[PDB]
Write a protein that binds this ligand. Sequence first.
Ligand code: MG
Ligand code: MG
Ligand code: MG
Ligand code: MG
Ligand code: MG
Ligand code: MG
Lengths: 123, 58, 35
Amino acid sequence: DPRIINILRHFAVLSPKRIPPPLRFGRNRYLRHWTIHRAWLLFRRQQREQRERILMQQHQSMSNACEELRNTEGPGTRETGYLYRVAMLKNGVYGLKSIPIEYASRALVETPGRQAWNHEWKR
Amino acid sequence: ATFVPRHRRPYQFTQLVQLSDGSTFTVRTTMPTALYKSAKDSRNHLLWQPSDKSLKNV
Amino acid sequence: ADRREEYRRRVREKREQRLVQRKEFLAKQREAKKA
RNA sequence: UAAUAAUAAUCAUGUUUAUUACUUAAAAAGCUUAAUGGCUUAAUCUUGCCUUACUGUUUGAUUAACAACAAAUCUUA
RNA sequence: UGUUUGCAAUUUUUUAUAGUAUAUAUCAAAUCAUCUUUAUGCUAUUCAUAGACCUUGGGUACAGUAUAAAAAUUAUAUAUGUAUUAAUUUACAUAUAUUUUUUCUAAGAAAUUAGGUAAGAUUUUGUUUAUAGAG
Ligand SMILES: [Mg+2]
Ligand SMILES: [Mg+2]
Ligand SMILES: [Mg+2]
Ligand SMILES: [Mg+2]
Ligand SMILES: [Mg+2]
Ligand SMILES: [Mg+2]
């Protein structure tokens, strides 16, 4: 009971009748937030257009490569489109071992570790 | 007259998380601990590090 | 506040008086020590 | 760096959990109780404020209610 | 002084001024319970004050990297140690409680409520995919 009463007190401060009220800004305060909200959503637009511009440029570099490759005769006696048809195959792309977990598991960090990189890694 | 509900969110802190590799990053959580040291995580697990021999005991 | 003003006043006012005779009996404790 | 042509993308001045409009067979669920019909653009559901589930009189119909009359049903001022 | 504290930002209305209908201010109502002591307390430091580590207290602090200068201040009954004064006055320190600040035992965890009106929502059933315990 004493431990359960402690839980119920945690749900009491979260009651709709006890949580803090909606903010009340004056004008100069309301306009300062309107200016900060307008610059944040603009910063997000710039980061979006940049983010999406690079993706479109990577995509076009792939297209220009896979368009040339589609019209290449070779190597040797292989006919036109061979390498192109071999590059468009998706064998193993949608399986369990598609992306190595040593690469995906390494998410970014604010500061590096004691050993940032392991040059002594051996096969 | 559809009610306009309000959000009921508990107090959230900013926490520093130190993985087993010594790397650090900041998160947002409800626990008041300022620094969370992690001794066992994905950086020290053989299922996430299949090519790490230090963690391989055979 | 002012209720504690006169208190801190009266207490210290006569506290020094309390030790005016503390000096005295300690003074006669010396000349009485002699001979 | 500019011009021209071609190709691709392009709702977005907006706290992407976007938003908005249109579209998504039939049956079924729900709508006081069987069955039938109907409603999804409301007759269902949710919420707010309410009690017109009011008083008197009254119009036009039910191819002149029930192949008469009466008790009835719908509707107008 | 209700309305967030740096400044004509919602709707309608009252009154006043200018003005010949408009313009500004103002007032009320609607929408919303935002919490408001400018410090009286706390904190740090120093000194008197005993003297082998004590009470009570007097100054100091100068605040945008805001600050000691309010992270939340009420009131009461009993009894006690210290000290007080012409007082169980006062402050201190507790213990026992009772208290306002609604601010700490989840109704936004419960009830199948069926009519009027207004707004909002628009496949809710079944089938099917997956999902600790879980068949
Ligand atoms: Mg962005
Ligand atoms: Mg109904
Ligand atoms: Mg209703
Ligand atoms: Mg007839
Ligand atoms: Mg279903
Ligand atoms: Mg199962």
